[PDB]
Design a protein around this ligand. Structure first.
Ligand SMILES: Nc1ncnc2c1ncn2[C@@H]1O[C@H](COP(=O)(O)OP(=O)(O)OP(=O)(O)O)[C@@H](O)[C@H]1O
Ligand SMILES: Nc1ncnc2c1ncn2[C@@H]1O[C@H](COP(=O)(O)OP(=O)(O)OP(=O)(O)O)[C@@H](O)[C@H]1O
Ligand SMILES: Nc1ncnc2c1ncn2[C@@H]1O[C@H](COP(=O)(O)OP(=O)(O)OP(=O)(O)O)[C@@H](O)[C@H]1O
Ligand SMILES: Nc1ncnc2c1ncn2[C@@H]1O[C@H](COP(=O)(O)OP(=O)(O)O)[C@@H](O)[C@H]1O
Ligand SMILES: [Mg+2]
Ligand SMILES: [Mg+2]
Ligand SMILES: [Mg+2]
Lengths: 752, 448, 172
């Protein structure tokens, strides 16, 4: 019932726009059964209504090849109604259209540049000669003739707005020529079709805005006053100003714009005077809509603000919205990123009655946003918008627009190589050769990042799952943890359980805990936020916990997101460790972290991964299931894994066949993953040393090392040492032993 | 303005938003504002007395008005327009609905009882939303682009009781639009065990509200403080989630360190604001998750400077001070109650301390059943044996066992679909073997 | 023909003295555009409403002198984060800048460039698409880069045969 107003109702007047066959600018074609249903006669004039309150008048004809639900019209009629092929318009009879007495038309500059002949005789007279064309004020019609077809704009008609161009109708074209910029702007207007992913929000906004104006008798009958205040809130780039523009363009009411700071004045009492004048202009031209953009700037809380001018402005707006003198025909809309900063008295009945949340679009909504954005663009067949929609997880409408623009610029970049770029103009053949390719979209996708998380962006070293040797079971769980809830949400609904979203990595240093996180940052299809341990700590009293809320809120907006805490033991502690630890801020940060992971709020697709080096000091509340449920131990690699590590490190390097990695791993019994890497790096340095002295020797006589050899590895081993001692190993085996022993009896089996 | 009023005496002057033009002269820097306040002082009571002129004013913040404007001869009487009670809001609804057309099934008594913290504006918003729902119900008859509405649809248009029920569902006090959070919709059935704790929680909010006369006859005031303490994952926050839905009172959820601020006196100002917000929307439940973050024993920290110890001092006066107690119920969940200030735990503030332990064998069966109510599970799997083996497991541990079994079932289901697609070019329910494999990864979260 | 609009926002961040202002001046000089410079501290005004009035006047003058390039020095000082800014004037300045860059009325044929030492101090809304949508990093000059800088600066001067600019670049 919420989206009932959006749900279109089938009507006999509703017709699908179809391509014209022989129709000119003044006629349309309907099927005979549809004409009989509409009680329309051939030769009758009809009134056509399109998007953005555009109207056109034409003559209805019959066409046996036209579908019953379709109507045929040329490009000019489509452009006059701002409609495209497949769109739906309404056709109704337009009686009492009188013969025109005097019509004024003005040509479009871009179709007249270089044309100096008499416009009337060359174009208008043959076009209107004995044709009795029906015209309306504001239509744009193209007339063939002369050296180039010329468009004209109807600026004045008598009678108005509908008239018939009779043989005695006076046609004159003198006046100021129309500007190309104005016509292009009028063609490119925002409507309700330009908003995507906000279907319920659009339903609510239409219910408050359009429904009372179109059908006020309904509200009069039910005996209630419709809400007259709308507050739109959401993160930047969600389309609040876009919806305001669409409402302004699509409504038949006076629209007034109020930017926040523009009201302010240094003179005493002039800001309230500006607000009063704006509102008075609103009731003067009623019904009216007032839009206030960036309301948080103009209307802070009176209790928490110190300036008297701000308080007086808030009071003036408060009285204007709801005072002793009631306003009836004025509707006030406002848009702000932070609604909680607004004065509480302004969030009430009679002042911003309803609040609409323009949130982050999901995959389906962002696919619609992409389809809306790319309708004007030229796209090849290989381009599929569904894949781009699926691969843009935290993106908002502005992010999608940026992605489309970057893809378009990448498309131009390809043609940049062919041309010298120093030509005075681009060749037409190269221009037609240019189109947006799926490769351009892929490059933009690689470059694209959500605007919400530009502060929390780091350059990951591009590690692949193949770069990691061993940890086969750990790899599978890591891929399944992010992929399963995202790519198979219906499976969890079927079984009726929420996913598990917590992982802790613990083990000796150099065993691959941070390496796994780098692979996730690249391979996994989710947003990634990297957090150093003490990064979130501040000396101010409440800012340490405030940083925790911001980073957790940032991950919720960009869901699905992976939140990785490197060195988790720095911010996670058992609490009560010391009598004084920064005034208790350390214990207070842990409590804030506890509520963010599992508190009284709906769970999102936020995955928290923590890599700790010593897990025995971590707070037991954090390791509880529902927060960090799955604990994974990354031990020193065994003999099989050490062979895999050696190939992973040496895969890129050119190494001789005579070296044996199996023997190399066998002798290095207790080495870490980083210990094995240091051996391979040391071999490279010895090879570089031998290469440098060889080329120096060759230059000396005038005035070698294609691959790493066995002797390079043998010399490298004498420098090699085991970083993780035996005593350190027992510490990690002890914590793992407690976890296994805590489970109780092993090998669980149901009886019988 | 005053001369025009005196010219046409008797007259009444109404000054809306008095605090806009009448701040304290001591705290005002602008010369114009102070001169305006002085002019008002002189005009309203000066050497030349008023010629029978009544002056009225309205303000949200009377304490911001200049003290000289409040003495007799200058705003003689102060009238407090406060939040209505159940009978008052029933009267407001009856006044509002005399113009509205309603069906016969509508009951304003239930609407008046259901709206707890609402003011007249909130009730008007509820009426408007119900009427909008009625219009939405009649939407599929009418067309947006039609020139007019059909007469039959207009006649059939009326506000029913279902529209009021939907409006009540969407309704929320305007005072409570900042302190609003999305609760995950937990019910009392979602919680397994804790039958004694469940009864106490329901009775603590229900008895003072539905039976105020019972306390008057017995002559004792209600008890309105609860502390939950226990090991992690044992249902402390679930009980608050069930209260946020099932209980018939307003709910405010407070994360612990939210209230703390950089600035000198704003941390304690946030405590006063949140407690005054709960008093306006009474009956209201104030929930403090991780109470040990805010209520920590004084003197522990040498240097904070003293803001941490000052915040808890503000809570002490708010919870129990020199003010009349309202129907504000304060519930706190703490993981470590040994560090709570003893002043917080005294009766009259947090009198009822409820200990939520690890579930026993009977409770673990109930926890396992509650998780599996909406899940398709094979009849072979017996929950009685599974609860017997898991002895020290918490409620979160039992849920993790069920979730991991589901993930194993989903993993097999995905593999089968890949298998069928591969051969072209399953798992209706969680089985017994899925739970066995999930059990080997299970572990006790809370140690001995 | 490709049916897109070019980006209208530039954010250059780097250490002081790196040459962001010189890059902006070179761009505005070689391209037929008017260079208009805005300094962050001088925009600040104690009077209420004067600062965003100055911003509006600057933008209108730049629109009059189109083609033009608007350059703002120290964007971090003029426009900090609104949630962390207690001062009302700075918050209203940020809101006015947001409305000037994007609103119901779309600015056309105007390019806004800003230079800041710390880009993360800027309000996150100002980093959105359509308003400083692209950020360019001007890092510390390399050895060959500083050699090229020395060659450019010493072209007007007279250099002996003994001097080697590469040695000076290496020692710097
Ligand atoms: N739902 C949407 N459908 C289509 N385009 C959208 C949508 N949302 C945003 N856009 C695009 O992104 C931009 C929206 O910017 P807009 O001014 O509406 O954002 P905003 O959230 O109101 O801004 P801010 O909060 O920063 O003031 C436009 O370029 C618009 O084309
Ligand atoms: N399984 C592995 N395969 C390949 N390289 C590995 C592996 N394990 C460790 N390394 C290497 O070890 C080095 C550092 O390892 P990493 O950063 O993953 O360690 P860590 O477990 O996070 O240790 P720390 O506790 O010291 O932070 C890198 O050079 C990495 O290539
Ligand atoms: N009695 C119970 N019945 C059903 N599920 C329970 C029960 N107790 C705990 N759970 C499960 O525990 C998880 C949430 O635990 P909860 O938030 O109640 O813990 P808590 O005691 O408040 O712990 P913490 O100290 O970490 O805040 C959910 O998965 C929930 O299903
Ligand atoms: N890349 C560069 N090439 C040549 N000169 C440079 C370069 N960067 C900085 N300079 C020198 O720096 C001086 C001005 O620095 P400026 O650009 O104002 O610093 P900032 O970037 O902090 O505004 C100029 O005299 C210019 O010669
Ligand atoms: Mg906006
Ligand atoms: Mg590491
Ligand atoms: Mg909890």
């Amino acid at each position: 019932l919420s989206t009932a107003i959006l749900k279109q109702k089938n009507r006999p007047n509703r017709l699908i726009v179809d391509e014209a066959i022989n129709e000119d600018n003044s006629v349309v074609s309907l099927s005979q059964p549809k004409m009989d249903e509409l009680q329309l006669f051939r030769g009758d004039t009809v009134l056509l209504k399109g998007k953005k309150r555009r109207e056109a008048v034409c003559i209805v004809l019959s066409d046996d090849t036209c579908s019953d639900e379709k109507i045929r019209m040329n490009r000019v009629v489509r452009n006059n109604l701002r409609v495209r092929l497949g769109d739906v318009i309404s056709i109704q009879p337009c009686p009492d259209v009188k013969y025109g007495k005097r019509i004024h038309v003005l040509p479009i500059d871009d179709t007249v540049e270089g044309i100096t002949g008499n416009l009337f005789e060359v174009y208008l007279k043959p076009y209107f000669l004995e044709a009795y064309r029906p015209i309306r004020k504001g239509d744009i019609f193209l007339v063939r003739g002369g050296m180039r077809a010329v468009e004209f704009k109807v600026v004045e008609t008598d009678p108005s707005p509908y008239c018939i161009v009779a043989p005695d109708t006076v046609i004159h074209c003198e006046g100021e020529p129309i500007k190309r910029e104005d016509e292009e702007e009028s063609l490119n207007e925002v409507g309700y079709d330009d908003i995507g992913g906000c279907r319920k929000q659009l339903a609510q906004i239409k219910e408050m805005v359009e429904l009372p104006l179109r059908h006020p008798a309904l509200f009069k009958e039910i005996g209630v006053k419709p809400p007259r205040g709308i507050l739109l809130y959401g993160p930047p780039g969600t389309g609040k100003t876009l919806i305001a523009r669409a409402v302004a363009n699509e409504t038949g009411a006076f629209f007034f714009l109020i930017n926040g700071p523009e009201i302010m004045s240094k003179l005493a009492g002039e800001s309230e005077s500006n607000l009063r004048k704006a509102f008075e202009e609103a009731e003067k031209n009623a019904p009216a809509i007032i839009f206030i953009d960036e309301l948080d700037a103009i209307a802070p809380k009176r209790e928490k603000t110190h300036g008297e001018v701000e308080r007086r402005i808030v009071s003036q707006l408060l009285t204007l919205m709801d005072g002793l003198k009631q306003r009836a025909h004025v509707i006030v809309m406002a848009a702000t990123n932070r609604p909680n900063s607004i004065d509480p008295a302004l969030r009430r009945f009679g002042r911003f009655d309803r609040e609409v949340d323009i949130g982050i679009p999901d995959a389906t909504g962002r696919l619609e946003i992409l389809q809306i954005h790319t309708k004007n663009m030229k796209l090849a067949d290989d381009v599929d918008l569904e894949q781009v929609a699926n691969e843009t997880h935290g993106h908002v409408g502005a992010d999608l627009a940026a992605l489309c623009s970057e893809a378009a610029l990448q498309a131009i970049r390809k043609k940049m190589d062919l041309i010298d770029l120093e030509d005075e103009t681009i060749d037409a053949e190269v221009m037609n050769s240019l189109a947006v390719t799926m490769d351009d979209f892929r490059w933009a996708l690689s470059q694209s990042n959500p605007s919400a998380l530009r502060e929390t962006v780091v350059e990951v070293p591009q590690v692949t799952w193949e770069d990691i040797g061993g940890l086969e079971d750990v790899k599978r769980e890591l891929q399944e943890l992010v992929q399963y809830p995202v790519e198979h949400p219906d499976k969890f609904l079927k079984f009726g359980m929420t996913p598990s979203k917590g992982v802790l990595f613990y083990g000796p240093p150099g065993c691959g805990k941070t390496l796994l996180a780098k692979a996730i940052a690249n391979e996994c299809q989710a947003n990634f936020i990297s957090i150093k341990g003490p990064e979130l700590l501040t000396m101010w009293f409440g800012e340490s916990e405030a940083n925790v809320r911001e980073i957790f809120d940032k991950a919720r907006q960009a869901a699905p997101c992976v939140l990785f805490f490197d060195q988790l033991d720095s911010i996670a502690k058992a609490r009560g460790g010391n009598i004084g630890d920064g005034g208790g801020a350390a214990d207070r940060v842990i409590n804030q972290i506890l509520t963010e992971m599992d508190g009284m709020s709906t769970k999102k697709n936020v995955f928290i991964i923590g890599a700790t080096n010593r897990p025995d000091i971590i707070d037991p509340a954090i390791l509880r299931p529902g927060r960090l449920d799955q604990l994974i131990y990354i031990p020193l690699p065994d003999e099989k894994s050490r062979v895999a590590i050696l190939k992973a490190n040496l895969r890129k390097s050119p190494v001789a066949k005579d070296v044996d990695l199996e023997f190399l791993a066998k002798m290095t019994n207790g080495f870490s993953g980083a210990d094995l890497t240091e051996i391979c790096q040391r071999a490279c340095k010895l090879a570089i040393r031998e290469s440098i002295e060889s080329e120096i020797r060759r230059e000396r006589e005038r005035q070698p090392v294609p691959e790493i050899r066995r002797d390079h590895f043998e010399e490298a081993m004498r420098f090699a040492r085991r970083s993780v001692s035996d005593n350190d190993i027992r510490k990690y085996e002890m914590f793992a032993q407690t976890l296994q022993q805590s489970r109780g009896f092993g090998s669980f089996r149901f009886p019988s």
